[PDB]
Design a protein around this motif. Structure first.
Motif, PDB file in Angstrom:
ATOM      1  N   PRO A   1       0.834  -1.221   0.000  1.00  0.00           N
ATOM      2  CA  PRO A   1       0.000   0.000   0.000  1.00  0.00           C
ATOM      3  C   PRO A   1       0.863   1.264   0.000  1.00  0.00           C
ATOM      4  CG  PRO A   1       0.145  -0.731   2.210  1.00  0.00           C
ATOM      5  CD  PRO A   1       0.786  -1.841   1.339  1.00  0.00           C
ATOM      6  N   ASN A   2       0.320   2.334  -0.577  1.00  0.00           N
ATOM      7  CA  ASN A   2       1.002   3.621  -0.616  1.00  0.00           C
ATOM      8  C   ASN A   2       0.115   4.701  -0.007  1.00  0.00           C
ATOM      9  OD1 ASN A   2       2.804   5.749  -1.153  1.00  0.00           O
ATOM     10  ND2 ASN A   2       1.671   6.202  -3.047  1.00  0.00           N
ATOM     11  N   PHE A   3       0.418   5.027   1.244  1.00  0.00           N
ATOM     12  CA  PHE A   3      -0.305   6.027   2.014  1.00  0.00           C
ATOM     13  C   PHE A   3       0.118   7.456   1.668  1.00  0.00           C
ATOM     14  CE2 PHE A   3      -2.500   3.584   5.412  1.00  0.00           C
ATOM     15  CZ  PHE A   3      -1.927   2.345   5.266  1.00  0.00           C
ATOM     16  N   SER A   4       1.193   7.602   0.896  1.00  0.00           N
ATOM     17  CA  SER A   4       1.732   8.914   0.539  1.00  0.00           C
ATOM     18  C   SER A   4       0.769   9.882  -0.126  1.00  0.00           C
ATOM     19  CB  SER A   4       2.964   8.762  -0.362  1.00  0.00           C
ATOM     20  OG  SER A   4       4.028   8.100   0.305  1.00  0.00           O
ATOM     21  N   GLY A   5       0.859  11.152   0.250  1.00  0.00           N
ATOM     22  CA  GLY A   5       0.016  12.162  -0.362  1.00  0.00           C
ATOM     23  C   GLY A   5      -0.425  13.264   0.578  1.00  0.00           C
ATOM     24  N   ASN A   6      -1.151  14.233   0.025  1.00  0.00           N
ATOM     25  CA  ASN A   6      -1.729  15.340   0.796  1.00  0.00           C
ATOM     26  C   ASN A   6      -3.217  15.001   0.890  1.00  0.00           C
ATOM     27  OD1 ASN A   6       0.568  17.355   1.131  1.00  0.00           O
ATOM     28  ND2 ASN A   6       0.617  16.927  -1.063  1.00  0.00           N
ATOM     29  N   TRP A   7      -3.672  14.767   2.114  1.00  0.00           N
ATOM     30  CA  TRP A   7      -5.036  14.343   2.361  1.00  0.00           C
ATOM     31  C   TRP A   7      -5.950  15.414   2.974  1.00  0.00           C
ATOM     32  CZ3 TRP A   7      -6.209   9.191   1.010  1.00  0.00           C
ATOM     33  CH2 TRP A   7      -5.115   8.333   0.774  1.00  0.00           C
ATOM     34  N   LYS A   8      -7.197  15.434   2.511  1.00  0.00           N
ATOM     35  CA  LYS A   8      -8.197  16.378   3.004  1.00  0.00           C
ATOM     36  C   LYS A   8      -9.326  15.550   3.594  1.00  0.00           C
ATOM     37  CE  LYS A   8     -10.641  18.703   0.198  1.00  0.00           C
ATOM     38  NZ  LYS A   8     -11.996  18.275   0.670  1.00  0.00           N
ATOM     39  N   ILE A   9      -9.897  16.017   4.695  1.00  0.00           N
ATOM     40  CA  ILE A   9     -10.951  15.260   5.352  1.00  0.00           C
ATOM     41  C   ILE A   9     -12.315  15.382   4.665  1.00  0.00           C
ATOM     42  CG2 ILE A   9     -11.668  17.050   6.973  1.00  0.00           C
ATOM     43  CD1 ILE A   9     -11.812  14.963   9.134  1.00  0.00           C
ATOM     44  N   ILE A  10     -13.094  14.299   4.678  1.00  0.00           N
ATOM     45  CA  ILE A  10     -14.422  14.315   4.085  1.00  0.00           C
ATOM     46  C   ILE A  10     -15.489  13.856   5.071  1.00  0.00           C
ATOM     47  CG2 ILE A  10     -13.669  14.151   1.654  1.00  0.00           C
ATOM     48  CD1 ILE A  10     -14.494  11.169   1.790  1.00  0.00           C
ATOM     49  N   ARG A  11     -15.067  13.284   6.195  1.00  0.00           N
ATOM     50  CA  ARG A  11     -16.006  12.835   7.230  1.00  0.00           C
ATOM     51  C   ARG A  11     -15.315  12.703   8.579  1.00  0.00           C
ATOM     52  NH1 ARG A  11     -20.748   9.854   7.643  1.00  0.00           N
ATOM     53  NH2 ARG A  11     -20.786   9.124   5.468  1.00  0.00           N
ATOM     54  N   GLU A  42      -0.239  15.534   5.647  1.00  0.00           N
ATOM     55  CA  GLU A  42       0.771  15.131   4.672  1.00  0.00           C
ATOM     56  C   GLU A  42       1.470  13.854   5.132  1.00  0.00           C
ATOM     57  OE1 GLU A  42       4.744  17.162   4.208  1.00  0.00           O
ATOM     58  OE2 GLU A  42       4.055  17.262   2.111  1.00  0.00           O
ATOM     59  N   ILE A  43       1.447  12.835   4.280  1.00  0.00           N
ATOM     60  CA  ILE A  43       2.076  11.569   4.597  1.00  0.00           C
ATOM     61  C   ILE A  43       3.137  11.259   3.543  1.00  0.00           C
ATOM     62  CG2 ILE A  43       1.727   9.059   4.865  1.00  0.00           C
ATOM     63  CD1 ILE A  43      -1.084   9.578   5.737  1.00  0.00           C
ATOM     64  N   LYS A  44       4.309  10.837   4.000  1.00  0.00           N
ATOM     65  CA  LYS A  44       5.405  10.435   3.124  1.00  0.00           C
ATOM     66  C   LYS A  44       5.795   9.039   3.600  1.00  0.00           C
ATOM     67  CE  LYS A  44       7.118  15.188   2.740  1.00  0.00           C
ATOM     68  NZ  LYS A  44       8.265  16.083   3.086  1.00  0.00           N
ATOM     69  N   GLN A  45       5.726   8.067   2.694  1.00  0.00           N
ATOM     70  CA  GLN A  45       6.054   6.681   3.015  1.00  0.00           C
ATOM     71  C   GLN A  45       7.172   6.144   2.123  1.00  0.00           C
ATOM     72  OE1 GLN A  45       2.842   4.011   2.241  1.00  0.00           O
ATOM     73  NE2 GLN A  45       3.972   2.192   2.855  1.00  0.00           N
ATOM     74  N   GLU A  46       8.126   5.448   2.726  1.00  0.00           N
ATOM     75  CA  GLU A  46       9.232   4.827   1.992  1.00  0.00           C
ATOM     76  C   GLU A  46       9.302   3.435   2.580  1.00  0.00           C
ATOM     77  OE1 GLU A  46      12.904   5.040   0.172  1.00  0.00           O
ATOM     78  OE2 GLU A  46      11.107   5.285  -1.098  1.00  0.00           O
ATOM     79  N   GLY A  47       8.583   2.499   1.981  1.00  0.00           N
ATOM     80  CA  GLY A  47       8.584   1.151   2.509  1.00  0.00           C
ATOM     81  C   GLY A  47       7.817   1.108   3.815  1.00  0.00           C
ATOM     82  N   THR A  61       1.285  18.337  14.615  1.00  0.00           N
ATOM     83  CA  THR A  61       2.086  17.209  15.094  1.00  0.00           C
ATOM     84  C   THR A  61       2.817  16.621  13.892  1.00  0.00           C
ATOM     85  OG1 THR A  61       0.299  15.533  14.809  1.00  0.00           O
ATOM     86  CG2 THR A  61       0.438  16.565  16.974  1.00  0.00           C
ATOM     87  N   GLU A  62       4.043  16.159  14.117  1.00  0.00           N
ATOM     88  CA  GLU A  62       4.854  15.525  13.078  1.00  0.00           C
ATOM     89  C   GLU A  62       5.432  14.276  13.703  1.00  0.00           C
ATOM     90  OE1 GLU A  62       7.452  18.262  10.741  1.00  0.00           O
ATOM     91  OE2 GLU A  62       6.808  19.695  12.298  1.00  0.00           O
ATOM     92  N   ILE A  63       5.090  13.107  13.186  1.00  0.00           N
ATOM     93  CA  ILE A  63       5.640  11.888  13.747  1.00  0.00           C
ATOM     94  C   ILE A  63       6.454  11.143  12.692  1.00  0.00           C
ATOM     95  CG2 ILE A  63       3.881  11.671  15.553  1.00  0.00           C
ATOM     96  CD1 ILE A  63       2.484   9.523  13.922  1.00  0.00           C
ATOM     97  N   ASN A  64       7.498  10.462  13.148  1.00  0.00           N
ATOM     98  CA  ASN A  64       8.375   9.680  12.278  1.00  0.00           C
ATOM     99  C   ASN A  64       8.506   8.312  12.918  1.00  0.00           C
ATOM    100  OD1 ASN A  64       9.863  11.517  10.125  1.00  0.00           O
ATOM    101  ND2 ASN A  64       9.784  12.710  12.028  1.00  0.00           N
ATOM    102  N   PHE A  65       8.141   7.275  12.177  1.00  0.00           N
ATOM    103  CA  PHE A  65       8.258   5.935  12.720  1.00  0.00           C
ATOM    104  C   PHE A  65       8.527   4.864  11.673  1.00  0.00           C
ATOM    105  CE2 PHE A  65       3.762   6.529  11.823  1.00  0.00           C
ATOM    106  CZ  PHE A  65       3.429   5.360  11.159  1.00  0.00           C
ATOM    107  N   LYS A  66       9.022   3.727  12.139  1.00  0.00           N
ATOM    108  CA  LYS A  66       9.251   2.584  11.282  1.00  0.00           C
ATOM    109  C   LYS A  66       8.314   1.542  11.890  1.00  0.00           C
ATOM    110  CE  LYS A  66      12.756  -0.656   9.559  1.00  0.00           C
ATOM    111  NZ  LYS A  66      11.809  -1.114   8.488  1.00  0.00           N
ATOM    112  N   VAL A  67       7.534   0.857  11.054  1.00  0.00           N
ATOM    113  CA  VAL A  67       6.613  -0.166  11.554  1.00  0.00           C
ATOM    114  C   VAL A  67       7.402  -1.251  12.296  1.00  0.00           C
ATOM    115  CG1 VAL A  67       4.802  -1.823  10.962  1.00  0.00           C
ATOM    116  CG2 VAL A  67       5.016   0.280   9.651  1.00  0.00           C
TER     117      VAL A  67
END
Ligand SMILES: CC1=C(/C=C/C(C)=C/C=C/C(C)=C/C(=O)O)C(C)(C)CCC1
Length: 137
Positions: A1-11, A42-47, A61-67
């Motif tokens: 899956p690719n969660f990357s992108g600029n997201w806007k809320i709809i609900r 804003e979400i940026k995913q690399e693996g 808030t800005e979080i950085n994590f590795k699963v």
């Protein structure tokens, strides 16, 4: 899956109720709910590495994590916690949170990519669940 992108809320469902369980007072809730209705995400995913920035007029808030690797962030109401994200399934990550100090409701969050291309975020405090849905801008 690719969660990357600029997201806007709809609900958004049950946000104030989640804040009530977390013990946020009436006036602070009023402020939080209004600001949270129009977030910039804003979400940026690399693996399995993620960077997630959630911005509002009153808090960013800005979080950085590795699963699979423990990290430190804050609960929705602002308390420091140790978090651990795992793949519940291929398109869904779940995060268990543990307060660094003190006691309070058990909290967690999940993020999942749906078949229609949207993103569902759930936030939990004990038995209350907040559901927010986004689509890319
Ligand atoms: C609780 C709370 C506050 C605001 C919280 C906000 C604004 C949360 C937004 C969350 C979002 C925007 C989540 C998401 O959609 O991922 C303020 C700073 C008033 C201080 C009192 C406690």
């Amino acid at each position: 899956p690719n969660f990357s992108g600029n997201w806007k809320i709809i609900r958004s469902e049950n946000f104030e109720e989640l804040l009530k369980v977390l013990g946020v007072n009436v006036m602070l809730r009023k402020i939080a709910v209004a600001a949270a209705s129009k977030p910039a995400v804003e979400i940026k995913q690399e693996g399995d590495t993620f960077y997630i920035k959630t911005s509002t007029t009153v808090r960013t808030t800005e979080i950085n994590f590795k699963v699979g690797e423990e990290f430190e962030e804050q609960t929705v109401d602002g308390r420091p916690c140790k978090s651990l994200v795992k793949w519940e399934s291929e398109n869904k990550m779940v995060c268990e949170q543990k307060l660094l100090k003190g006691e309070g409701p058990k909290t967690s969050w999940t993020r999942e990519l749906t078949n229609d291309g949207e993103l569902i975020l759930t936030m939990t405090a004990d038995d209350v669940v907040c559901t927010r849905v986004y689509v890319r801008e």
